[PDB]
CSV table of C-alpha atoms and ligand atoms in Angstrom, one decimal:
chain,number,residue,atom,x,y,z
E,1,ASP,CA,47.3,87.4,-37.4
E,2,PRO,CA,48.0,87.1,-33.9
E,3,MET,CA,45.5,85.0,-31.6
E,4,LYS,CA,43.7,86.8,-28.7
E,5,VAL,CA,42.1,86.0,-25.8
E,6,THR,CA,39.5,88.3,-24.1
E,7,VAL,CA,37.9,87.0,-20.6
E,8,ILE,CA,34.0,88.0,-21.0
E,9,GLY,CA,33.1,86.4,-17.6
E,10,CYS,CA,35.2,84.4,-15.1
E,11,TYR,CA,32.9,83.5,-12.0
E,12,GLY,CA,31.7,79.9,-11.2
E,13,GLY,CA,28.3,79.2,-10.4
E,14,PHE,CA,26.8,82.7,-10.7
E,15,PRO,CA,27.7,85.7,-11.2
E,16,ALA,CA,29.1,88.2,-8.6
E,17,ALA,CA,27.7,92.0,-8.6
E,18,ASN,CA,28.0,93.3,-12.1
E,19,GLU,CA,30.2,90.6,-13.4
E,20,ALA,CA,29.6,87.3,-15.3
E,21,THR,CA,30.2,83.3,-15.6
E,22,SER,CA,32.3,81.5,-17.7
E,23,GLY,CA,32.9,83.1,-21.4
E,24,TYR,CA,36.0,83.4,-23.2
E,25,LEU,CA,36.4,85.2,-26.7
E,26,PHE,CA,39.0,83.9,-28.8
E,27,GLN,CA,40.1,85.8,-31.8
E,28,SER,CA,42.2,85.3,-35.0
E,29,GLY,CA,41.9,88.2,-37.9
E,30,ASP,CA,38.2,88.2,-38.9
E,31,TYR,CA,37.6,85.1,-36.9
E,32,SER,CA,35.8,85.1,-33.6
E,33,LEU,CA,34.9,82.0,-31.6
E,34,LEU,CA,32.9,82.0,-28.1
E,35,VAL,CA,34.1,79.5,-25.6
E,36,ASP,CA,31.3,78.7,-22.9
E,37,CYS,CA,28.4,81.3,-22.6
E,38,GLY,CA,27.2,81.6,-19.2
E,39,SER,CA,25.4,84.3,-17.0
E,40,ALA,CA,25.8,87.8,-18.2
E,41,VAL,CA,28.2,86.8,-21.1
E,42,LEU,CA,26.2,88.1,-23.6
E,43,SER,CA,25.8,91.8,-22.5
E,44,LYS,CA,29.5,91.8,-21.6
E,45,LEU,CA,30.3,90.3,-24.9
E,46,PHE,CA,28.5,92.9,-27.5
E,47,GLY,CA,31.0,95.4,-25.7
E,48,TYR,CA,33.7,93.6,-28.0
E,49,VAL,CA,32.0,91.9,-30.4
E,50,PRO,CA,28.3,92.4,-32.0
E,51,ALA,CA,26.3,89.2,-32.4
E,52,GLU,CA,26.4,89.1,-36.0
E,53,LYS,CA,30.1,89.2,-36.5
E,54,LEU,CA,30.2,86.2,-34.1
E,55,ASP,CA,31.1,83.3,-36.0
E,56,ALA,CA,30.9,80.2,-33.4
E,57,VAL,CA,30.4,78.9,-30.3
E,58,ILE,CA,31.8,75.9,-28.4
E,59,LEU,CA,30.5,74.7,-25.1
E,60,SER,CA,32.6,72.7,-22.7
E,61,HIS,CA,29.3,71.2,-20.9
E,62,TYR,CA,25.9,72.0,-20.1
E,63,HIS,CA,25.8,73.3,-16.4
E,64,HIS,CA,23.9,76.6,-16.2
E,65,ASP,CA,27.1,78.8,-15.7
E,66,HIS,CA,28.5,77.8,-19.1
E,67,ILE,CA,25.2,77.9,-21.2
E,68,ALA,CA,22.8,80.3,-19.4
E,69,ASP,CA,23.4,83.1,-22.3
E,70,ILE,CA,22.5,80.5,-25.4
E,71,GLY,CA,18.6,81.2,-25.6
E,72,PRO,CA,19.2,85.0,-25.6
E,73,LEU,CA,22.0,84.3,-28.2
E,74,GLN,CA,19.5,82.6,-30.5
E,75,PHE,CA,17.0,85.4,-30.1
E,76,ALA,CA,19.8,88.1,-30.6
E,77,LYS,CA,20.3,86.0,-34.3
E,78,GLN,CA,16.6,86.2,-35.1
E,79,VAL,CA,16.5,89.8,-34.3
E,80,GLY,CA,19.4,90.2,-36.5
E,81,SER,CA,17.6,88.3,-39.5
E,82,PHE,CA,14.7,90.2,-39.0
E,83,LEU,CA,16.7,93.6,-39.3
E,84,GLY,CA,18.4,92.4,-42.3
E,85,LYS,CA,21.8,91.9,-40.9
E,86,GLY,CA,23.0,88.7,-42.2
E,87,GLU,CA,21.2,85.3,-42.5
E,88,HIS,CA,24.3,83.2,-41.8
E,89,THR,CA,23.6,80.3,-39.1
E,90,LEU,CA,25.7,80.6,-36.1
E,91,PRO,CA,27.3,77.3,-35.3
E,92,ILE,CA,27.5,76.2,-31.9
E,93,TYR,CA,29.6,73.4,-31.2
E,94,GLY,CA,28.9,71.2,-28.1
E,95,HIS,CA,29.0,67.4,-27.1
E,96,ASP,CA,26.3,65.0,-27.7
E,97,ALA,CA,26.4,62.5,-24.5
E,98,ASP,CA,23.6,64.6,-23.1
E,99,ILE,CA,21.1,64.6,-26.1
E,100,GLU,CA,18.3,66.8,-24.6
E,101,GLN,CA,21.0,69.6,-23.9
E,102,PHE,CA,22.5,69.2,-27.3
E,103,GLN,CA,19.0,69.7,-29.1
E,104,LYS,CA,18.5,73.0,-27.5
E,105,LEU,CA,21.4,74.3,-29.4
E,106,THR,CA,19.5,74.2,-33.2
E,107,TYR,CA,17.1,77.3,-33.2
E,108,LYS,CA,15.3,77.5,-36.7
E,109,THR,CA,17.7,78.9,-39.3
E,110,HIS,CA,19.6,80.9,-36.9
E,111,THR,CA,22.0,78.6,-34.9
E,112,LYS,CA,22.8,75.2,-35.5
E,113,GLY,CA,24.1,72.9,-33.0
E,114,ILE,CA,27.0,70.5,-34.4
E,115,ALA,CA,28.1,67.9,-32.3
E,116,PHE,CA,32.1,67.8,-31.5
E,117,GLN,CA,33.5,64.1,-31.3
E,118,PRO,CA,35.9,64.0,-28.4
E,119,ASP,CA,38.3,61.8,-30.1
E,120,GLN,CA,38.9,63.8,-33.5
E,121,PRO,CA,40.4,67.6,-33.9
E,122,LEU,CA,37.8,70.1,-34.8
E,123,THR,CA,38.4,72.9,-36.9
E,124,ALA,CA,36.9,76.5,-36.1
E,125,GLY,CA,38.1,79.0,-38.9
E,126,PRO,CA,42.1,79.2,-38.3
E,127,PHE,CA,41.6,77.2,-35.2
E,128,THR,CA,42.1,73.8,-34.5
E,129,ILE,CA,40.7,72.6,-31.0
E,130,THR,CA,41.5,69.2,-29.6
E,131,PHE,CA,39.5,67.9,-26.0
E,132,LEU,CA,39.9,65.9,-23.2
E,133,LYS,CA,37.1,64.9,-20.8
E,134,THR,CA,37.2,66.1,-17.2
E,135,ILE,CA,36.3,64.8,-13.8
E,136,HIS,CA,33.1,66.5,-13.1
E,137,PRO,CA,29.6,65.5,-11.9
E,138,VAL,CA,28.2,66.3,-15.5
E,139,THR,CA,29.9,65.5,-19.1
E,140,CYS,CA,32.5,68.1,-19.6
E,141,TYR,CA,35.4,68.6,-22.1
E,142,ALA,CA,38.7,70.6,-21.6
E,143,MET,CA,39.9,72.2,-25.0
E,144,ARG,CA,43.2,72.7,-26.4
E,145,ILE,CA,43.0,75.6,-29.1
E,146,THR,CA,45.9,76.3,-31.6
E,147,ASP,CA,46.1,78.4,-34.6
E,148,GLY,CA,49.7,76.8,-35.5
E,149,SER,CA,51.8,79.4,-33.7
E,150,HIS,CA,50.3,79.5,-30.6
E,151,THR,CA,48.2,77.5,-28.0
E,152,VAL,CA,46.0,77.9,-25.4
E,153,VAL,CA,44.4,74.9,-22.9
E,154,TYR,CA,41.2,75.7,-21.3
E,155,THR,CA,40.7,73.2,-18.7
E,156,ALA,CA,36.8,73.8,-18.4
E,157,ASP,CA,35.4,72.4,-15.0
E,158,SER,CA,37.6,69.3,-13.4
E,159,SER,CA,38.8,67.9,-10.4
E,160,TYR,CA,42.5,67.4,-10.6
E,161,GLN,CA,43.9,64.5,-13.0
E,162,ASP,CA,47.0,63.7,-14.1
E,163,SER,CA,46.0,63.5,-17.9
E,164,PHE,CA,45.8,67.0,-17.8
E,165,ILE,CA,49.4,67.2,-17.9
E,166,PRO,CA,50.0,65.6,-21.3
E,167,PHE,CA,47.0,67.3,-22.9
E,168,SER,CA,48.4,70.8,-21.9
E,169,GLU,CA,52.1,70.1,-22.7
E,170,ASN,CA,53.8,73.2,-23.9
E,171,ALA,CA,50.7,75.8,-23.9
E,172,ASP,CA,51.6,79.1,-24.0
E,173,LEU,CA,48.6,79.9,-21.8
E,174,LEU,CA,46.5,77.3,-19.6
E,175,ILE,CA,43.3,78.9,-18.4
E,176,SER,CA,42.6,76.7,-15.1
E,177,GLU,CA,39.4,76.9,-13.2
E,178,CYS,CA,40.1,77.3,-9.7
E,179,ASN,CA,37.1,77.4,-7.6
E,180,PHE,CA,38.8,76.4,-4.3
E,181,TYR,CA,41.7,77.9,-1.9
E,182,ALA,CA,45.1,75.7,-1.3
E,183,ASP,CA,43.4,74.3,2.1
E,184,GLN,CA,40.4,73.0,0.3
E,185,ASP,CA,39.4,69.8,-1.3
E,186,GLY,CA,37.5,70.3,-4.5
E,187,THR,CA,37.2,67.0,-5.3
E,188,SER,CA,33.5,66.2,-4.5
E,189,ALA,CA,32.2,69.3,-6.3
E,190,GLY,CA,34.3,68.4,-9.6
E,191,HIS,CA,36.7,71.4,-8.9
E,192,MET,CA,40.4,72.3,-8.6
E,193,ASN,CA,42.3,74.3,-6.1
E,194,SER,CA,45.1,76.8,-6.6
E,195,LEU,CA,48.0,74.1,-6.0
E,196,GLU,CA,46.2,71.7,-8.6
E,197,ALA,CA,46.0,74.6,-11.1
E,198,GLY,CA,50.0,75.4,-10.4
E,199,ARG,CA,50.7,71.6,-10.6
E,200,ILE,CA,49.1,71.4,-14.1
E,201,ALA,CA,51.2,74.6,-15.4
E,202,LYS,CA,54.2,73.6,-13.8
E,203,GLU,CA,54.3,69.9,-15.1
E,204,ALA,CA,53.1,70.4,-18.6
E,205,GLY,CA,55.7,73.6,-18.8
E,206,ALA,CA,53.0,75.9,-19.8
E,207,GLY,CA,54.0,79.8,-20.5
E,208,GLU,CA,51.5,81.3,-18.0
E,209,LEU,CA,49.0,80.4,-16.0
E,210,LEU,CA,45.2,82.1,-15.6
E,211,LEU,CA,43.1,81.3,-12.6
E,212,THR,CA,39.3,81.3,-13.4
E,213,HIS,CA,35.8,80.0,-12.5
E,214,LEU,CA,36.4,81.8,-9.3
E,215,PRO,CA,34.7,81.4,-5.9
E,216,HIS,CA,32.4,83.8,-4.0
E,217,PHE,CA,34.5,84.4,-0.6
E,218,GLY,CA,38.1,84.8,0.3
E,219,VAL,CA,40.7,86.9,-1.3
E,220,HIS,CA,41.2,85.9,-4.7
E,221,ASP,CA,45.0,87.3,-4.7
E,222,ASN,CA,45.6,84.4,-2.2
E,223,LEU,CA,44.7,81.8,-5.3
E,224,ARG,CA,47.8,83.4,-7.1
E,225,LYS,CA,50.1,83.5,-4.1
E,226,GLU,CA,49.3,79.7,-3.5
E,227,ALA,CA,49.5,78.7,-7.2
E,228,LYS,CA,52.9,80.5,-7.3
E,229,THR,CA,54.2,78.2,-4.2
E,230,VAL,CA,54.0,75.4,-7.0
E,231,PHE,CA,54.4,76.9,-10.2
E,232,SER,CA,57.3,79.3,-11.0
E,233,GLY,CA,56.1,80.9,-14.1
E,234,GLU,CA,53.2,84.4,-14.3
E,235,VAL,CA,50.1,83.4,-12.7
E,236,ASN,CA,47.1,86.1,-13.3
E,237,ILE,CA,43.4,86.1,-11.7
E,238,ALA,CA,40.9,86.4,-14.6
E,239,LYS,CA,38.5,89.3,-14.9
E,240,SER,CA,36.0,90.4,-17.6
E,241,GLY,CA,38.4,92.4,-20.1
E,242,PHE,CA,41.4,90.4,-19.1
E,243,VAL,CA,43.3,90.0,-22.4
E,244,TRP,CA,45.8,87.5,-23.4
E,245,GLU,CA,47.2,88.0,-26.9
E,246,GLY,CA,50.6,86.3,-28.8
G,1,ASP,CA,6.6,101.2,4.0
G,2,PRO,CA,6.8,102.7,0.3
G,3,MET,CA,6.2,100.2,-2.8
G,4,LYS,CA,9.8,101.0,-4.6
G,5,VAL,CA,10.4,99.5,-8.3
G,6,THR,CA,13.6,99.2,-9.6
G,7,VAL,CA,14.1,98.1,-13.1
G,8,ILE,CA,16.9,95.5,-13.4
G,9,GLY,CA,16.8,95.2,-17.2
G,10,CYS,CA,14.7,96.6,-20.0
G,11,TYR,CA,15.8,95.2,-23.4
G,12,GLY,CA,13.6,92.9,-25.8
G,13,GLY,CA,14.9,89.3,-26.8
G,14,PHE,CA,18.6,89.9,-25.8
G,15,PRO,CA,20.7,92.5,-24.2
G,16,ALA,CA,22.4,95.5,-25.6
G,17,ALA,CA,26.0,95.6,-24.8
G,18,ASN,CA,26.4,96.0,-21.2
G,19,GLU,CA,22.4,95.9,-20.8
G,20,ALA,CA,19.9,93.5,-19.6
G,21,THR,CA,16.6,92.2,-20.7
G,22,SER,CA,13.6,91.9,-18.4
G,23,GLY,CA,13.9,91.7,-14.7
G,24,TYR,CA,11.9,94.4,-12.3
G,25,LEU,CA,12.8,94.2,-8.5
G,26,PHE,CA,9.7,95.3,-6.3
G,27,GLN,CA,10.5,95.9,-2.7
G,28,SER,CA,8.3,96.9,0.3
G,29,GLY,CA,10.1,97.0,4.0
G,30,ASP,CA,12.3,93.9,4.1
G,31,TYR,CA,10.5,92.0,1.3
G,32,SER,CA,12.1,91.5,-1.9
G,33,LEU,CA,10.0,90.4,-5.4
G,34,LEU,CA,11.9,89.7,-8.6
G,35,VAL,CA,9.4,89.9,-11.4
G,36,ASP,CA,11.1,87.9,-14.4
G,37,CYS,CA,14.7,86.9,-14.5
G,38,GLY,CA,16.2,87.6,-18.0
G,39,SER,CA,19.7,87.9,-19.7
G,40,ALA,CA,22.4,89.7,-17.4
G,41,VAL,CA,19.5,90.1,-14.8
G,42,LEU,CA,21.1,88.5,-11.8
G,43,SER,CA,24.5,90.3,-12.3
G,44,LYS,CA,22.6,93.7,-12.3
G,45,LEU,CA,20.4,92.5,-9.7
G,46,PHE,CA,23.1,91.7,-7.1
G,47,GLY,CA,24.2,95.3,-7.1
G,48,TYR,CA,20.9,96.3,-5.4
G,49,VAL,CA,20.0,93.0,-3.5
G,50,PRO,CA,22.1,89.9,-2.5
G,51,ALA,CA,20.7,86.6,-3.7
G,52,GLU,CA,20.0,85.2,0.1
G,53,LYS,CA,17.9,88.6,0.8
G,54,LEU,CA,15.8,87.8,-2.1
G,55,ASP,CA,12.3,86.5,-1.0
G,56,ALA,CA,10.4,85.6,-4.2
G,57,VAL,CA,10.6,85.5,-8.0
G,58,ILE,CA,7.5,85.6,-10.4
G,59,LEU,CA,7.7,84.8,-14.0
G,60,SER,CA,5.4,86.2,-16.6
G,61,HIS,CA,6.5,83.5,-19.1
G,62,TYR,CA,9.0,81.3,-20.6
G,63,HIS,CA,10.6,83.1,-22.9
G,64,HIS,CA,14.4,83.3,-22.9
G,65,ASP,CA,14.4,86.8,-22.3
G,66,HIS,CA,12.5,86.5,-19.4
G,67,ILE,CA,13.8,83.2,-17.6
G,68,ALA,CA,18.0,82.9,-19.0
G,69,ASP,CA,18.8,83.9,-15.2
G,70,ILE,CA,16.9,81.2,-13.4
G,71,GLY,CA,19.6,78.1,-13.6
G,72,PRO,CA,22.2,80.7,-12.3
G,73,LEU,CA,19.8,81.7,-9.5
G,74,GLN,CA,19.6,78.3,-8.7
G,75,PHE,CA,23.2,77.7,-8.6
G,76,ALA,CA,23.7,80.9,-6.4
G,77,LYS,CA,21.0,79.6,-3.7
G,78,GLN,CA,23.2,76.3,-3.9
G,79,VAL,CA,26.3,78.2,-3.1
G,80,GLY,CA,24.7,80.2,-0.5
G,81,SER,CA,23.6,77.2,1.4
G,82,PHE,CA,27.5,75.6,1.0
G,83,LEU,CA,28.6,78.9,2.8
G,84,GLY,CA,26.0,78.4,5.4
G,85,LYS,CA,23.9,81.7,4.3
G,86,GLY,CA,20.6,80.4,4.9
G,87,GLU,CA,18.7,77.4,3.7
G,88,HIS,CA,15.4,78.9,3.2
G,89,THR,CA,13.8,77.6,-0.3
G,90,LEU,CA,13.4,80.6,-2.8
G,91,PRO,CA,9.6,80.3,-4.1
G,92,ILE,CA,9.7,81.0,-8.0
G,93,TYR,CA,5.9,81.3,-9.3
G,94,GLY,CA,5.3,80.6,-12.6
G,95,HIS,CA,2.3,79.6,-14.8
G,96,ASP,CA,1.7,75.5,-15.6
G,97,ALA,CA,0.2,75.6,-18.9
G,98,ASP,CA,3.7,74.9,-20.0
G,99,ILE,CA,4.7,71.7,-17.5
G,100,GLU,CA,8.0,71.0,-18.9
G,101,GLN,CA,9.1,74.9,-18.4
G,102,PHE,CA,7.3,74.9,-15.0
G,103,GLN,CA,9.3,71.8,-13.8
G,104,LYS,CA,12.5,73.2,-14.2
G,105,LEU,CA,11.7,75.8,-11.4
G,106,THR,CA,12.4,73.6,-8.6
G,107,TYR,CA,16.2,72.6,-7.6
G,108,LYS,CA,16.7,70.5,-4.5
G,109,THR,CA,15.6,72.1,-1.6
G,110,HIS,CA,17.3,75.8,-3.1
G,111,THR,CA,14.5,76.8,-5.3
G,112,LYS,CA,10.7,75.5,-5.2
G,113,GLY,CA,8.4,76.4,-8.2
G,114,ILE,CA,4.9,77.1,-7.4
G,115,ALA,CA,1.9,77.7,-10.0
G,116,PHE,CA,0.3,80.6,-9.9
G,117,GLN,CA,-3.3,80.4,-10.7
G,118,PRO,CA,-4.4,83.0,-13.4
G,119,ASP,CA,-7.8,83.3,-12.1
G,120,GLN,CA,-6.9,84.1,-8.2
G,121,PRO,CA,-5.1,86.7,-6.4
G,122,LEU,CA,-1.5,85.6,-5.4
G,123,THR,CA,-0.3,86.8,-1.9
G,124,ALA,CA,3.7,87.5,-2.0
G,125,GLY,CA,4.7,89.0,1.5
G,126,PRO,CA,3.0,92.4,1.4
G,127,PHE,CA,1.8,92.4,-2.2
G,128,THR,CA,-1.0,90.9,-3.7
G,129,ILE,CA,-0.8,90.1,-7.4
G,130,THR,CA,-3.7,89.4,-10.1
G,131,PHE,CA,-3.2,88.1,-13.8
G,132,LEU,CA,-4.3,88.8,-17.2
G,133,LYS,CA,-3.5,86.3,-20.1
G,134,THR,CA,-1.6,88.5,-23.1
G,135,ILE,CA,-1.8,87.9,-26.7
G,136,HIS,CA,1.7,86.5,-27.4
G,137,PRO,CA,3.1,83.5,-29.2
G,138,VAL,CA,3.5,81.7,-26.0
G,139,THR,CA,1.5,81.7,-22.8
G,140,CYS,CA,2.2,84.7,-20.9
G,141,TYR,CA,0.6,86.8,-17.9
G,142,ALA,CA,0.4,90.1,-17.2
G,143,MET,CA,0.8,91.6,-13.5
G,144,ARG,CA,-1.3,93.8,-11.3
G,145,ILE,CA,0.6,94.3,-8.2
G,146,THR,CA,-0.7,96.0,-5.2
G,147,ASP,CA,0.7,96.5,-1.6
G,148,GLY,CA,-2.9,98.1,-0.6
G,149,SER,CA,-1.9,101.9,-1.0
G,150,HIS,CA,0.0,101.9,-4.4
G,151,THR,CA,-0.4,99.8,-7.4
G,152,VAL,CA,1.7,98.8,-10.3
G,153,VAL,CA,0.6,96.9,-13.6
G,154,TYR,CA,3.3,95.1,-15.9
G,155,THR,CA,1.9,94.2,-19.3
G,156,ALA,CA,4.8,91.8,-19.5
G,157,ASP,CA,4.5,91.0,-23.3
G,158,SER,CA,1.9,91.1,-25.6
G,159,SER,CA,0.0,92.7,-28.8
G,160,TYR,CA,-2.7,95.0,-28.0
G,161,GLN,CA,-6.3,94.2,-26.3
G,162,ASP,CA,-9.0,96.2,-24.6
G,163,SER,CA,-8.7,93.9,-21.7
G,164,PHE,CA,-5.6,95.6,-20.5
G,165,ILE,CA,-7.8,98.9,-19.8
G,166,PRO,CA,-9.9,97.2,-17.1
G,167,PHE,CA,-7.2,95.4,-15.8
G,168,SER,CA,-5.0,98.3,-15.3
G,169,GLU,CA,-7.4,100.7,-14.1
G,170,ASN,CA,-6.4,103.4,-11.9
G,171,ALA,CA,-2.8,102.0,-11.7
G,172,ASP,CA,-0.2,104.3,-10.2
G,173,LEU,CA,2.5,103.1,-12.7
G,174,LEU,CA,1.8,101.2,-15.8
G,175,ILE,CA,4.9,99.3,-17.1
G,176,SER,CA,4.2,98.4,-20.7
G,177,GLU,CA,6.2,96.8,-23.1
G,178,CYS,CA,6.9,98.6,-26.2
G,179,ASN,CA,9.1,96.8,-28.8
G,180,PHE,CA,7.9,98.7,-31.7
G,181,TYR,CA,7.8,102.2,-33.0
G,182,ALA,CA,4.4,104.1,-34.1
G,183,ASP,CA,4.6,103.5,-37.8
G,184,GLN,CA,5.1,99.6,-37.1
G,185,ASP,CA,2.8,96.8,-36.6
G,186,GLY,CA,3.7,94.6,-33.4
G,187,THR,CA,0.8,92.0,-33.8
G,188,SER,CA,2.7,89.0,-35.6
G,189,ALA,CA,5.1,89.0,-33.2
G,190,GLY,CA,2.9,89.6,-30.0
G,191,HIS,CA,4.2,92.9,-29.2
G,192,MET,CA,3.0,96.5,-28.7
G,193,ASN,CA,4.1,99.8,-30.0
G,194,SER,CA,4.0,103.2,-28.7
G,195,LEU,CA,0.6,104.5,-29.7
G,196,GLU,CA,-1.1,101.6,-27.9
G,197,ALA,CA,0.9,101.4,-24.8
G,198,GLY,CA,-0.3,105.3,-24.8
G,199,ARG,CA,-3.7,104.2,-25.1
G,200,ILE,CA,-3.7,101.9,-22.2
G,201,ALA,CA,-2.3,104.5,-19.8
G,202,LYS,CA,-4.8,107.0,-21.2
G,203,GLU,CA,-8.0,104.7,-21.1
G,204,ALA,CA,-7.2,103.2,-17.8
G,205,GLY,CA,-6.6,106.6,-16.2
G,206,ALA,CA,-2.5,105.4,-15.3
G,207,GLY,CA,-1.0,107.7,-13.2
G,208,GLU,CA,2.0,107.3,-15.4
G,209,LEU,CA,3.7,105.2,-18.3
G,210,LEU,CA,6.9,103.5,-18.4
G,211,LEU,CA,8.2,102.3,-21.6
G,212,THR,CA,10.1,98.8,-21.6
G,213,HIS,CA,11.0,95.9,-23.7
G,214,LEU,CA,12.9,97.8,-25.8
G,215,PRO,CA,14.0,97.7,-29.6
G,216,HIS,CA,17.4,97.4,-30.7
G,217,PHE,CA,17.2,100.0,-33.6
G,218,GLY,CA,15.9,103.7,-33.8
G,219,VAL,CA,15.6,106.5,-31.4
G,220,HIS,CA,14.3,105.1,-28.0
G,221,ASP,CA,13.5,108.6,-27.0
G,222,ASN,CA,11.2,109.0,-30.0
G,223,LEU,CA,9.0,106.0,-28.1
G,224,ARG,CA,8.3,108.6,-25.4
G,225,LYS,CA,7.1,111.2,-27.8
G,226,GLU,CA,5.1,108.9,-29.9
G,227,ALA,CA,3.4,107.5,-26.5
G,228,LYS,CA,2.9,111.3,-25.3
G,229,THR,CA,0.4,111.9,-28.6
G,230,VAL,CA,-2.1,109.8,-27.1
G,231,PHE,CA,-1.4,109.7,-23.3
G,232,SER,CA,-1.2,113.1,-21.6
G,233,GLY,CA,0.5,112.0,-18.6
G,234,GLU,CA,4.1,111.3,-17.7
G,235,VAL,CA,5.8,109.1,-19.9
G,236,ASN,CA,9.6,107.7,-19.0
G,237,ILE,CA,12.0,105.1,-21.2
G,238,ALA,CA,13.1,102.0,-18.8
G,239,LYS,CA,16.9,101.7,-18.1
G,240,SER,CA,18.5,99.6,-15.8
G,241,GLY,CA,18.6,101.4,-12.3
G,242,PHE,CA,15.3,103.3,-13.3
G,243,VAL,CA,13.4,103.9,-9.6
G,244,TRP,CA,9.8,104.5,-9.0
G,245,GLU,CA,8.8,105.0,-5.7
G,246,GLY,CA,5.4,105.7,-4.3
A,301,CA,CA1,33.6,87.4,-38.0
A,302,CA,CA1,52.1,88.4,-19.2
A,303,CA,CA1,14.3,89.7,2.2
A,304,CA,CA1,7.9,111.3,-12.1
A,305,ZN,ZN1,31.3,75.9,-14.1
A,306,ZN,ZN1,30.4,72.6,-14.0
A,307,ZN,ZN1,10.1,89.0,-23.9
A,308,ZN,ZN1,8.0,87.0,-25.1
């Protein structure tokens, strides 16, 4: 089975009109993993995959734009059980440096929070996930997701660090946050710009680069042109429905 | 100015594919009030009204399907201020029987939680709102919203009670939850069926009835036919984009 990644939502902070914030659907064969679960992500997700066919969720961090739809997901599982659609508890993986946030992940027998350990590989069906702590105003982890043949790296949210380069080494697809333009400094907000995303893809030898966690001003296509001044491979701008498959 | 109500989202519990859960936009002249703020509501809302033009939010209760988008709304206000779009704090009205939930409404100088008092009229620009406690598994308040010429009643979530009849007396539009079909009993879930919604519209003399908080099974048009076996006025099924204006 090939690894198939579908962007479900891609705005930073809050949704643009009729769009969504962070959510990425990773699929392999019958396995479905949702990476982050932000604003309007469930609404958009169910157009690709029904709640009962979702096998697991994993959360990079607990900012609203990455977890806003967890509650509604818990209710979706509850309604599924009430309608007889399967009682399998959906695992929701998250870090437990923030205990109060982690405790919200477990809802009756419908969803079960499981703490990932940042120094250990996590198995999720046919995927193996490893983690890198980001530089961000709350605890946040980037993820490297492989199925043994292809490898996708998701930066989650971060300002720039050299450690992203070894972490992302030889990734087929680097999904990098890019909340700021080339002229701007995202350090104080815990975000990166186009040049920084480009630098990671370049020095890591990423197969290609996908820019996401997008801003609500400017010409988004400029983020791609700016990234291409540094990285010579393929660079795309994320949108709901964007599909990568290898 | 006429009172204009736009349904932003109308599913109970969690969103159907490409839809939304509870959110209703009430407008009068330049004033904009959002009643409830559930899953995918911000995404859909911004297609009608940008965040910075939103004057107030009011929350019937703190179930996920009515508040999931509050966090992202707080970030939208923060990004608005960072971009220079106005620093006016958006008031978010809610009950304070649940203190922990009420405390989440205030975020820096961007949003400010204000406790409504259920026994007192609330002024919201040109609207006056009065409240009725519902029968629901968490504290919840129905709302009667008038501008002095027209009056809309929103049941929020509730199982049936006689007190809805005097509360909704002579409303031009009764927006009633209707999470269950005529053959089913919604009492143990704190919800109503089609016959119960119909009964309220009938005995209150409502100008018309709008059924919302919809289920994820069955033929939704049957809810309208069932309600019409009791109420002889106009009955519609809610959908995102539904507009009532008087
Ligand atoms: Ca599955
Ligand atoms: Ca390509
Ligand atoms: Ca306004
Ligand atoms: Ca009509
Ligand atoms: Zn973020
Ligand atoms: Zn963040
Ligand atoms: Zn509800
Ligand atoms: Zn409720």
